[PDB]
mmCIF file of N, CA and C and ligand atoms in Angstrom:
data_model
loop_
_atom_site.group_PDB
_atom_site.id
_atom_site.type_symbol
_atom_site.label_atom_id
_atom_site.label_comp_id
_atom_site.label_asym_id
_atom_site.label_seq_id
_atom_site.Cartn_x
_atom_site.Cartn_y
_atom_site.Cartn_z
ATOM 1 N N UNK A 1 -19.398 -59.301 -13.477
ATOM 2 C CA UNK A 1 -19.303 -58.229 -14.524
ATOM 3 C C UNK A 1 -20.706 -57.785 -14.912
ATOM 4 N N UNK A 2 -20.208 -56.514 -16.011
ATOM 5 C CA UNK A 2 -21.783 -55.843 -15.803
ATOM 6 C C UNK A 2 -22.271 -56.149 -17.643
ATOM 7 N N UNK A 3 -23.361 -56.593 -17.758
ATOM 8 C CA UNK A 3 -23.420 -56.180 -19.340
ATOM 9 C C UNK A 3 -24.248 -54.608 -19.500
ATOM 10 N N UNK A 4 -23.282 -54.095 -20.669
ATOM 11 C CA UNK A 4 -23.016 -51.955 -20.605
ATOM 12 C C UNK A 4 -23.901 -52.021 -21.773
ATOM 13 N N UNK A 5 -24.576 -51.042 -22.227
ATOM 14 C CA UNK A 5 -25.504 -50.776 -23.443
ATOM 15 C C UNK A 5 -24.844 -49.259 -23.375
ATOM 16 N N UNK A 6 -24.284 -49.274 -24.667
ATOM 17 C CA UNK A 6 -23.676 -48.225 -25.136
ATOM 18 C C UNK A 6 -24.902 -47.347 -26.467
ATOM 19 N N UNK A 7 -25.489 -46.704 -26.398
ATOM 20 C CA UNK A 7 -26.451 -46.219 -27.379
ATOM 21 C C UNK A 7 -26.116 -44.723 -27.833
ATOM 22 N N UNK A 8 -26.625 -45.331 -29.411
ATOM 23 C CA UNK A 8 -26.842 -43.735 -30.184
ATOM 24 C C UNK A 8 -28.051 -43.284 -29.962
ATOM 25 N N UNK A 9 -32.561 -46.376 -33.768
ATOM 26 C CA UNK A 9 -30.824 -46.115 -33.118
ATOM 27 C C UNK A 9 -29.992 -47.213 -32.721
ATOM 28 N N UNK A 10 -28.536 -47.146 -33.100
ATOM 29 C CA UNK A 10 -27.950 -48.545 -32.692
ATOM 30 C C UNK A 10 -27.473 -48.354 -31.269
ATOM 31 N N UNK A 11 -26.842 -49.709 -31.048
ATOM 32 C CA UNK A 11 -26.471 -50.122 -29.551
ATOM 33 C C UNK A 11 -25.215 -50.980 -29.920
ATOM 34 N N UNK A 12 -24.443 -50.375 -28.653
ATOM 35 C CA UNK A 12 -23.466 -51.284 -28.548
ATOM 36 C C UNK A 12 -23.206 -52.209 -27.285
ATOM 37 N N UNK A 13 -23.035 -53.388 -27.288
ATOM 38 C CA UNK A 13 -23.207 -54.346 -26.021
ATOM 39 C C UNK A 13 -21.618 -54.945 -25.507
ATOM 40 N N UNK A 14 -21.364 -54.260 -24.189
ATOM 41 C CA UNK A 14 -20.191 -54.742 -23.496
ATOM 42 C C UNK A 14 -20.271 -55.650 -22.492
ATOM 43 N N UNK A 15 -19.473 -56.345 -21.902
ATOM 44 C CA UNK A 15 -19.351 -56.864 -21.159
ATOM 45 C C UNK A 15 -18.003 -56.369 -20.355
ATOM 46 N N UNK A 16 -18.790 -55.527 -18.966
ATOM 47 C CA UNK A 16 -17.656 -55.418 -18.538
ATOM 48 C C UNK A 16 -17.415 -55.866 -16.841
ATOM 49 N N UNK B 1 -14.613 -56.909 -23.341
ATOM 50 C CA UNK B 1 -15.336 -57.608 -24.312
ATOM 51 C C UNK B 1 -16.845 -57.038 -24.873
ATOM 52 N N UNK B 2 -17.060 -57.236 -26.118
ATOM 53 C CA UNK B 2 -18.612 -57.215 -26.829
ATOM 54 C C UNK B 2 -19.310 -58.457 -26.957
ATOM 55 N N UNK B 3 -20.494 -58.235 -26.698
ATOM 56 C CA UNK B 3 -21.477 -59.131 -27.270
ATOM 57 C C UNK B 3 -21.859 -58.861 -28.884
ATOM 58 N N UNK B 4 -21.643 -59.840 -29.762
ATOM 59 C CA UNK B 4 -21.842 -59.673 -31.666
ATOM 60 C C UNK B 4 -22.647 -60.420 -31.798
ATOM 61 N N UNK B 5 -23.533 -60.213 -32.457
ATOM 62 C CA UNK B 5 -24.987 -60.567 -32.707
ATOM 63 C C UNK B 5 -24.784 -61.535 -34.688
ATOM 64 N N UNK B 6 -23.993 -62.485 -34.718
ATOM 65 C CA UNK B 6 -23.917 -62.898 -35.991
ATOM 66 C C UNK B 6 -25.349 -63.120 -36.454
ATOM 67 N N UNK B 7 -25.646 -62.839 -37.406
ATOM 68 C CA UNK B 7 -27.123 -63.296 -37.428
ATOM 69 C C UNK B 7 -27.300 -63.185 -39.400
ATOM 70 N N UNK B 8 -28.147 -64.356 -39.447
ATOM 71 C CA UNK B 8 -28.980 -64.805 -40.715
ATOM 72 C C UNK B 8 -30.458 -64.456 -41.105
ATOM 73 N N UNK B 9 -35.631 -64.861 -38.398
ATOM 74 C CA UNK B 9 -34.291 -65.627 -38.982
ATOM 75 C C UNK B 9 -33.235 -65.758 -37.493
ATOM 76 N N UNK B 10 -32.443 -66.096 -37.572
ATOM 77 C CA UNK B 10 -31.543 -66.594 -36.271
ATOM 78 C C UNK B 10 -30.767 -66.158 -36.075
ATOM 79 N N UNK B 11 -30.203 -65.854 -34.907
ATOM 80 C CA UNK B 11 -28.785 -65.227 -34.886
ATOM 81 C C UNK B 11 -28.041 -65.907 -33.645
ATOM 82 N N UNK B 12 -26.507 -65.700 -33.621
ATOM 83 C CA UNK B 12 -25.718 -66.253 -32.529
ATOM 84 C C UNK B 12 -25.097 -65.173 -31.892
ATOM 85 N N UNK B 13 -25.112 -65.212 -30.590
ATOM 86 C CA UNK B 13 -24.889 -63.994 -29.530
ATOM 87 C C UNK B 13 -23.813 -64.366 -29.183
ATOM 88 N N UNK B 14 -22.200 -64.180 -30.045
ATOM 89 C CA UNK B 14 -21.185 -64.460 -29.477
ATOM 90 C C UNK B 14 -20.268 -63.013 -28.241
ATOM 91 N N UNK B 15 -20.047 -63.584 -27.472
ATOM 92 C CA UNK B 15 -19.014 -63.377 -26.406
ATOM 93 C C UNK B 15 -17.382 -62.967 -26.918
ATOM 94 N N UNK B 16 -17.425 -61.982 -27.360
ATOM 95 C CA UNK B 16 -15.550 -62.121 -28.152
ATOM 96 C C UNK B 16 -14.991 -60.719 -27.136
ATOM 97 N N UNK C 1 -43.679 -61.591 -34.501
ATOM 98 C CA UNK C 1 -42.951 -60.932 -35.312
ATOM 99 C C UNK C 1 -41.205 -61.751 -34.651
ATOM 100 N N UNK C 2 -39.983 -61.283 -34.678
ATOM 101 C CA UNK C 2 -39.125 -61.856 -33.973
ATOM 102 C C UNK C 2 -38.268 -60.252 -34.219
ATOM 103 N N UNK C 3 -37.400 -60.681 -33.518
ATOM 104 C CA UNK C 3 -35.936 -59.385 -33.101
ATOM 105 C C UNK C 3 -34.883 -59.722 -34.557
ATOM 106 N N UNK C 4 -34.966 -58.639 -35.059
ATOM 107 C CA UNK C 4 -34.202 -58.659 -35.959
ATOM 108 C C UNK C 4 -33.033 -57.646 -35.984
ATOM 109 N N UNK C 5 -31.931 -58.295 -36.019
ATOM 110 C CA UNK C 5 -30.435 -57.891 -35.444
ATOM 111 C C UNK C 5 -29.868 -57.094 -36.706
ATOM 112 N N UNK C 6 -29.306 -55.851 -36.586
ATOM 113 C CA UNK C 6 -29.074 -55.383 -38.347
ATOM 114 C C UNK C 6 -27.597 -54.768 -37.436
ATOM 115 N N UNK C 7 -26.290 -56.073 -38.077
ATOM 116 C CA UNK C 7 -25.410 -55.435 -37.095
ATOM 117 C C UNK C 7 -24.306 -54.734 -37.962
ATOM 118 N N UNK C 8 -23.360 -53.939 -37.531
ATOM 119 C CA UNK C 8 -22.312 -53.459 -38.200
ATOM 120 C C UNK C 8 -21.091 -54.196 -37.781
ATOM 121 N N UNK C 9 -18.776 -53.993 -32.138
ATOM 122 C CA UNK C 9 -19.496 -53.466 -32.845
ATOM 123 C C UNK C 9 -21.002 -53.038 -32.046
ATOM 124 N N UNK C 10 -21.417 -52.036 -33.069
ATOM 125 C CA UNK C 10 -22.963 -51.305 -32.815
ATOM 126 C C UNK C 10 -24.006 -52.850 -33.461
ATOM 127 N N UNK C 11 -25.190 -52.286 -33.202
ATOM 128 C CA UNK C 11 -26.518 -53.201 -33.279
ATOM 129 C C UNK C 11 -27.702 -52.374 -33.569
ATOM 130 N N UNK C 12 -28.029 -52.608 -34.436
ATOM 131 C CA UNK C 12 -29.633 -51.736 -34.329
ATOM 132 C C UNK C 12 -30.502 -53.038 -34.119
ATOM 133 N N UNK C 13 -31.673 -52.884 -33.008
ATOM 134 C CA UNK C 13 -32.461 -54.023 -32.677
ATOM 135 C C UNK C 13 -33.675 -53.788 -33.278
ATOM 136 N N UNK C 14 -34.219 -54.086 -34.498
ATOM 137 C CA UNK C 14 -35.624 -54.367 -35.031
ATOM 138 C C UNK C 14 -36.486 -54.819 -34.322
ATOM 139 N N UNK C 15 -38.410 -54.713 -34.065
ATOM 140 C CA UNK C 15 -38.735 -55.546 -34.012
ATOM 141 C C UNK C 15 -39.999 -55.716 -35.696
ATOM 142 N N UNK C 16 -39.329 -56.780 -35.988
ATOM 143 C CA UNK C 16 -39.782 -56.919 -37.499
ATOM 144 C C UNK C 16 -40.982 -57.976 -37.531
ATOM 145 N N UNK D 1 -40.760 -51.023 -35.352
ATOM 146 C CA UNK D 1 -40.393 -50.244 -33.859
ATOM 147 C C UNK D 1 -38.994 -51.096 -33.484
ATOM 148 N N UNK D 2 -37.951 -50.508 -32.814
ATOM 149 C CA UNK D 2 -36.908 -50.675 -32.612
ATOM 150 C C UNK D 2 -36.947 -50.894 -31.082
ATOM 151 N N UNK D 3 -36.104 -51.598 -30.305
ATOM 152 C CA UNK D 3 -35.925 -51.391 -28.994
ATOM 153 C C UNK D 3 -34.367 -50.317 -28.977
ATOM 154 N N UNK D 4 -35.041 -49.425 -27.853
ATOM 155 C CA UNK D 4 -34.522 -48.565 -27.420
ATOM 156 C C UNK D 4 -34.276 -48.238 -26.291
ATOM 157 N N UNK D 5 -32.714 -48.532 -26.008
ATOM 158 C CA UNK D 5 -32.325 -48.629 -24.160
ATOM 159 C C UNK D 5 -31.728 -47.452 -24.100
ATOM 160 N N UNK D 6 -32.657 -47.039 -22.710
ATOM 161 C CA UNK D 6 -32.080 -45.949 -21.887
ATOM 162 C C UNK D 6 -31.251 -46.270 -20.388
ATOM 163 N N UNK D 7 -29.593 -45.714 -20.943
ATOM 164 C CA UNK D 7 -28.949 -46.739 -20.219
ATOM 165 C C UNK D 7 -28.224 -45.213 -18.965
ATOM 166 N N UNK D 8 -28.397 -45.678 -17.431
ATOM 167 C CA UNK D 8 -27.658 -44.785 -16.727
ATOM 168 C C UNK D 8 -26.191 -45.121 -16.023
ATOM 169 N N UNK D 9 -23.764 -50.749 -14.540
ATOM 170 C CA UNK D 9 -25.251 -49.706 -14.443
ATOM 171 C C UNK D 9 -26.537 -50.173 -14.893
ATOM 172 N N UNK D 10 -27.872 -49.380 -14.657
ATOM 173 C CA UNK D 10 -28.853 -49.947 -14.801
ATOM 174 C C UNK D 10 -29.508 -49.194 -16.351
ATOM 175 N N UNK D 11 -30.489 -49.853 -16.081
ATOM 176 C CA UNK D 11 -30.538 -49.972 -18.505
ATOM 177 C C UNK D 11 -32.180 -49.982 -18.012
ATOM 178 N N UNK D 12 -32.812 -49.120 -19.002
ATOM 179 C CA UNK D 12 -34.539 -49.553 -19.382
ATOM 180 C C UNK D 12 -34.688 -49.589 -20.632
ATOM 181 N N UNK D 13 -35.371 -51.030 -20.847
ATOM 182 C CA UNK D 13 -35.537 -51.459 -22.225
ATOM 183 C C UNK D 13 -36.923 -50.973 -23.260
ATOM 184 N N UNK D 14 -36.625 -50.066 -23.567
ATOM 185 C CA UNK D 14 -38.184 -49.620 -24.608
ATOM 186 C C UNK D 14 -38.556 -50.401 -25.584
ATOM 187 N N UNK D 15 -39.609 -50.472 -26.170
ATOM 188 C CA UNK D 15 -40.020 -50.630 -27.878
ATOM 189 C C UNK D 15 -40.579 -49.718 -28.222
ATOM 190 N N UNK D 16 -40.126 -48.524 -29.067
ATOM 191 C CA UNK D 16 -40.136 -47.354 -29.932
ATOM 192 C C UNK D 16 -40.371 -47.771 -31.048
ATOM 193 N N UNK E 1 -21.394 -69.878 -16.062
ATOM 194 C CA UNK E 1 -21.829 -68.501 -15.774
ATOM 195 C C UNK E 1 -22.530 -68.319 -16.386
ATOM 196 N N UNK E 2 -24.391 -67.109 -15.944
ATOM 197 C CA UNK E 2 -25.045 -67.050 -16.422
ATOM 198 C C UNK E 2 -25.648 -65.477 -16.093
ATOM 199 N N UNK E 3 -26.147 -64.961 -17.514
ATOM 200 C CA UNK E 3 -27.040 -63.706 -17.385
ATOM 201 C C UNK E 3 -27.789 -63.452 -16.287
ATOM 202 N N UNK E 4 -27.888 -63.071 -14.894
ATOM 203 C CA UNK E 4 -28.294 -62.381 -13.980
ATOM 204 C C UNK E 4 -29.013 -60.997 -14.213
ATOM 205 N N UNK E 5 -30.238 -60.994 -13.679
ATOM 206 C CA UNK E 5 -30.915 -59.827 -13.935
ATOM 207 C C UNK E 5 -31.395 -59.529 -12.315
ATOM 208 N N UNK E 6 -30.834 -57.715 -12.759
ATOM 209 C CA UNK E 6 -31.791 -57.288 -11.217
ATOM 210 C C UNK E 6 -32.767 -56.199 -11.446
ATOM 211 N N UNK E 7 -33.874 -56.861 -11.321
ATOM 212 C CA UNK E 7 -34.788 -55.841 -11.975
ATOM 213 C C UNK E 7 -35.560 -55.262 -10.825
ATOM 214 N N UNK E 8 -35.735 -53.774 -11.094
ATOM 215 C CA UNK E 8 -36.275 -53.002 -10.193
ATOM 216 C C UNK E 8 -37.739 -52.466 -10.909
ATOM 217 N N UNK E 9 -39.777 -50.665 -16.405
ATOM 218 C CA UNK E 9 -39.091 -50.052 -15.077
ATOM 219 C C UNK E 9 -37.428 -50.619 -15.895
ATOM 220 N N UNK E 10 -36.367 -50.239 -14.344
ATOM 221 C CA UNK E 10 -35.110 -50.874 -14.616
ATOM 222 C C UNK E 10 -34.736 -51.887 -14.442
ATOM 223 N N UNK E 11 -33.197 -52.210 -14.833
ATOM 224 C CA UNK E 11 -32.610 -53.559 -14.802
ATOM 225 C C UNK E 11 -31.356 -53.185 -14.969
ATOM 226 N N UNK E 12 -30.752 -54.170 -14.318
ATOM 227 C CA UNK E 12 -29.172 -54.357 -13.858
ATOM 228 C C UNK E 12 -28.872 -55.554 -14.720
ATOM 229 N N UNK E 13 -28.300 -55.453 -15.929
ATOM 230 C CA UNK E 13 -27.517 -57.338 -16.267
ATOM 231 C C UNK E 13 -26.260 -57.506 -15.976
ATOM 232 N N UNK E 14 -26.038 -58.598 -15.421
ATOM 233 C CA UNK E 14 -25.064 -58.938 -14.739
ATOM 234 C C UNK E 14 -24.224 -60.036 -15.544
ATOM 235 N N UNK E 15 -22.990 -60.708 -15.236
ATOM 236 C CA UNK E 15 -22.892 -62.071 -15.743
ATOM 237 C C UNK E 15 -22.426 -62.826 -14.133
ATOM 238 N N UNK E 16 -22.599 -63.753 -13.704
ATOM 239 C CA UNK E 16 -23.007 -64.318 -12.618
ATOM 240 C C UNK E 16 -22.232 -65.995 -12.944
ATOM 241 N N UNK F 1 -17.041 -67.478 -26.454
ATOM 242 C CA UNK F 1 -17.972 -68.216 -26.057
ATOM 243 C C UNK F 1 -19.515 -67.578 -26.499
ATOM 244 N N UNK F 2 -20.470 -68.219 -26.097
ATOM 245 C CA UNK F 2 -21.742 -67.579 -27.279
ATOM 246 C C UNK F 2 -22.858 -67.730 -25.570
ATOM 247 N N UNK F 3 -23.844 -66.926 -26.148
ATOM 248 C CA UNK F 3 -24.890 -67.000 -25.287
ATOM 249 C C UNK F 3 -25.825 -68.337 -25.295
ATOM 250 N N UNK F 4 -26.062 -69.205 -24.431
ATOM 251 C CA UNK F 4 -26.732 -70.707 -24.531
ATOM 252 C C UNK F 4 -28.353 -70.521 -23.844
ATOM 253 N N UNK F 5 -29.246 -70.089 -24.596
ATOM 254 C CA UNK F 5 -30.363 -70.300 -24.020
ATOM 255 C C UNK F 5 -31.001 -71.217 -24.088
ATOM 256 N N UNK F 6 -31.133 -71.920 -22.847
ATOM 257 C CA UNK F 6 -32.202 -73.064 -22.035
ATOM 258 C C UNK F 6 -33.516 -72.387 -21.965
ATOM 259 N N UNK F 7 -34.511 -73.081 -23.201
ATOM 260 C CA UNK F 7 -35.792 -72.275 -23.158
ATOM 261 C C UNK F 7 -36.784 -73.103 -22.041
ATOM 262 N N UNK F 8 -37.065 -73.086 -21.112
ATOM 263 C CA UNK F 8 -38.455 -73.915 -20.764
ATOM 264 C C UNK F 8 -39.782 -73.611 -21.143
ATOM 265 N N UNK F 9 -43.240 -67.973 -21.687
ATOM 266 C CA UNK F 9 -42.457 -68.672 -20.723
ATOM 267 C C UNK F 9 -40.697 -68.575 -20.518
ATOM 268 N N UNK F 10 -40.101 -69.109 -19.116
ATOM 269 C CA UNK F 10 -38.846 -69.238 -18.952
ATOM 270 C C UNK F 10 -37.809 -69.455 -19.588
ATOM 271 N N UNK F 11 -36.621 -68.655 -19.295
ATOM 272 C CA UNK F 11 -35.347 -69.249 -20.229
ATOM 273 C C UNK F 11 -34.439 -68.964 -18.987
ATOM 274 N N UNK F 12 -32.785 -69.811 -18.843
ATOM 275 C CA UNK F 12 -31.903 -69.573 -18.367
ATOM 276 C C UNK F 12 -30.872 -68.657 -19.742
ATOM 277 N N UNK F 13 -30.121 -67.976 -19.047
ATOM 278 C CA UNK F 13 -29.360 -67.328 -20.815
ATOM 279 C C UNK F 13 -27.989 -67.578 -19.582
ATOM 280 N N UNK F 14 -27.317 -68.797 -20.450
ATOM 281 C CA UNK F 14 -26.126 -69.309 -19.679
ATOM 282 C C UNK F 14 -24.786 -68.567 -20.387
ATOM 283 N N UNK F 15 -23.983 -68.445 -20.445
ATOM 284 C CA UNK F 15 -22.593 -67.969 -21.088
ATOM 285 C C UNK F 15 -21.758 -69.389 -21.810
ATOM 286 N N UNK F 16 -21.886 -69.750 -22.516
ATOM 287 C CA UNK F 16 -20.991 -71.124 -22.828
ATOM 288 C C UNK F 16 -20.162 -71.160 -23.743
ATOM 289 N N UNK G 1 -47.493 -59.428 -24.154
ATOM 290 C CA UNK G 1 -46.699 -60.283 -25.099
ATOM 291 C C UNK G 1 -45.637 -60.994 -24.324
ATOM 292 N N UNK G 2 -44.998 -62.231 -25.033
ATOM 293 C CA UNK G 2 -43.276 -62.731 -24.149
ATOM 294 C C UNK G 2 -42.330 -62.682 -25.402
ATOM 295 N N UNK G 3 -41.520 -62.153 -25.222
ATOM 296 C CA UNK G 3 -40.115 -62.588 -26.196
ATOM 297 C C UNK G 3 -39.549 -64.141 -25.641
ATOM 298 N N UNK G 4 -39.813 -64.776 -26.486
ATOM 299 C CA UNK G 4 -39.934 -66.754 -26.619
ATOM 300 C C UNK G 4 -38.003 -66.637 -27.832
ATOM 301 N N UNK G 5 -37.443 -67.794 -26.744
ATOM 302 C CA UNK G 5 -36.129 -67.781 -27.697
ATOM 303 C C UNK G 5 -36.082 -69.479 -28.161
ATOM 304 N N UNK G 6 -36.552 -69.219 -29.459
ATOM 305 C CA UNK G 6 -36.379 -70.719 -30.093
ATOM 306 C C UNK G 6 -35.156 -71.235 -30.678
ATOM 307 N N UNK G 7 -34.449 -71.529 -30.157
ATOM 308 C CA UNK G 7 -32.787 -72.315 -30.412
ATOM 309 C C UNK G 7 -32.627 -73.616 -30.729
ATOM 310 N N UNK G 8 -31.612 -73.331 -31.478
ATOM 311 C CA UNK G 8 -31.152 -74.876 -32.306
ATOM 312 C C UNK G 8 -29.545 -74.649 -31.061
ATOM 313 N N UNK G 9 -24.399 -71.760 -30.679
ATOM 314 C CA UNK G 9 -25.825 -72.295 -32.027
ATOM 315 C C UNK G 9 -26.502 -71.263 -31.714
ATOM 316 N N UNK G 10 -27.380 -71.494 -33.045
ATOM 317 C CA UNK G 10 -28.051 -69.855 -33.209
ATOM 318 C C UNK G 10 -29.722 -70.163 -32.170
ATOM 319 N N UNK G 11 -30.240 -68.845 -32.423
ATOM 320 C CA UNK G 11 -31.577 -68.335 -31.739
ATOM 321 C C UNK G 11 -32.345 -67.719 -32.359
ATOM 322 N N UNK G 12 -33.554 -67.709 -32.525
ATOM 323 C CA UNK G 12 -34.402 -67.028 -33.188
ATOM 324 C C UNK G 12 -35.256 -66.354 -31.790
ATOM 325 N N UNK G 13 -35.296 -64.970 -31.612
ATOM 326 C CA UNK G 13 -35.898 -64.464 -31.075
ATOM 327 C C UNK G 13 -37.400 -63.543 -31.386
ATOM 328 N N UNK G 14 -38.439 -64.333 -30.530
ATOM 329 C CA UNK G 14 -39.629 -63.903 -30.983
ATOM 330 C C UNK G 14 -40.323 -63.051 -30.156
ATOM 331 N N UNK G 15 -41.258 -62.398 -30.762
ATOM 332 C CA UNK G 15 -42.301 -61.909 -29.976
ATOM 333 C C UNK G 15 -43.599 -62.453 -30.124
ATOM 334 N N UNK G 16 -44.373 -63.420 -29.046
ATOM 335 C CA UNK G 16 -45.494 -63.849 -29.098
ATOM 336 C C UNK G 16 -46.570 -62.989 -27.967
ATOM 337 N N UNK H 1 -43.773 -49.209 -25.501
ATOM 338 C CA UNK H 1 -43.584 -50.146 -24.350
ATOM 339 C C UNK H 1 -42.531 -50.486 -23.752
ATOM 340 N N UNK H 2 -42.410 -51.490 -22.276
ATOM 341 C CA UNK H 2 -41.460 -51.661 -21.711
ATOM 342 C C UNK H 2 -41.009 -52.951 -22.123
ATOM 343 N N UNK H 3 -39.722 -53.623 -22.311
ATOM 344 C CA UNK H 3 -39.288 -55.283 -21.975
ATOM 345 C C UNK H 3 -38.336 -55.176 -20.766
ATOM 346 N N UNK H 4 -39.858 -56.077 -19.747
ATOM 347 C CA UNK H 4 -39.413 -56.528 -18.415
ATOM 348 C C UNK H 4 -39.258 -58.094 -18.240
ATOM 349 N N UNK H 5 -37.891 -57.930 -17.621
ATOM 350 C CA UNK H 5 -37.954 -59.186 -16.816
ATOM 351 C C UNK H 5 -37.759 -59.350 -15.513
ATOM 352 N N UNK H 6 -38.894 -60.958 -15.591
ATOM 353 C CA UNK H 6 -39.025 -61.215 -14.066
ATOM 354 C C UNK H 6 -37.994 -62.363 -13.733
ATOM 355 N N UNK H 7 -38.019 -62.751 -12.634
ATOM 356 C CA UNK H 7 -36.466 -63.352 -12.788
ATOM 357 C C UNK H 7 -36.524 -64.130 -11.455
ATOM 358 N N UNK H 8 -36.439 -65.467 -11.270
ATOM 359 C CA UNK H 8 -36.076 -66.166 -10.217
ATOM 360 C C UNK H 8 -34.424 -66.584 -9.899
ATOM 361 N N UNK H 9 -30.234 -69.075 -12.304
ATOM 362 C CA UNK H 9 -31.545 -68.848 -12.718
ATOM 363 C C UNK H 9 -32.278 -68.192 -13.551
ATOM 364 N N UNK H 10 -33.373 -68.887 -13.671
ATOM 365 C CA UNK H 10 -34.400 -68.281 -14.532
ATOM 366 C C UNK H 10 -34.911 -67.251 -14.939
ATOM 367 N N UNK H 11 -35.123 -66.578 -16.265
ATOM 368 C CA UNK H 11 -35.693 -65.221 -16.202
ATOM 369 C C UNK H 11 -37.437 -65.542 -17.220
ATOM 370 N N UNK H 12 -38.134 -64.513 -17.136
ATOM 371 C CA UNK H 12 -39.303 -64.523 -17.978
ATOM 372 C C UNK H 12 -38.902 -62.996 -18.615
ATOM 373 N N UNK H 13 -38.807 -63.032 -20.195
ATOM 374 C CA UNK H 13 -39.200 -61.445 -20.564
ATOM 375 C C UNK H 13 -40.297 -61.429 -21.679
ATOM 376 N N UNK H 14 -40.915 -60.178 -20.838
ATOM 377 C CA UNK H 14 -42.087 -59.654 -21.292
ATOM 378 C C UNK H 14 -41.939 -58.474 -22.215
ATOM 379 N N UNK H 15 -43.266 -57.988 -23.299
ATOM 380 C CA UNK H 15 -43.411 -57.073 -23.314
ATOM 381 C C UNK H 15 -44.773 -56.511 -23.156
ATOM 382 N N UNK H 16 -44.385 -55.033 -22.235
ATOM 383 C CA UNK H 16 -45.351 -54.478 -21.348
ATOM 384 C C UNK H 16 -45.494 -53.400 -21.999
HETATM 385 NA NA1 NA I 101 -29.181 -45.398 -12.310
HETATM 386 NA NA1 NA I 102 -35.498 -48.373 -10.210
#
């Protein structure tokens, strides 16, 4: 799996 | 899933 | 200085 | 200064 | 399982 | 599960 | 500089 | 600046 950085500044951290 | 950053300084990088 | 986590999920990553 | 990822997967990690 | 990085600058995180 | 860093400089960032 | 992760579980992440 | 890591396993992160 991948870890995703979701960004606006904040961040959001997935694991997908 | 996210990675959550609980945090107090220290924090715990939970997996939920 | 250290990473300072300001979380709501989103993350804003400090470095403080 | 904040870290700031520029994400396309592959991610570059700034300090802004 | 552990954080995997492919770093090319960029980076790929993985979980491994 | 939480992120387990093995610090030796080096770190492993294990998933545990 | 290195970002150094001093851990007890939580982490304190530094910049030295 | 950049935070790179080098990475054998093991990673080193820097900031560049
Ligand atoms: Na790309
Ligand atoms: Na590249």
């Amino acid at each position: 799996a991948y870890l995703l950085f979701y960004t606006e500044a904040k961040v959001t951290v997935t694991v997908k």
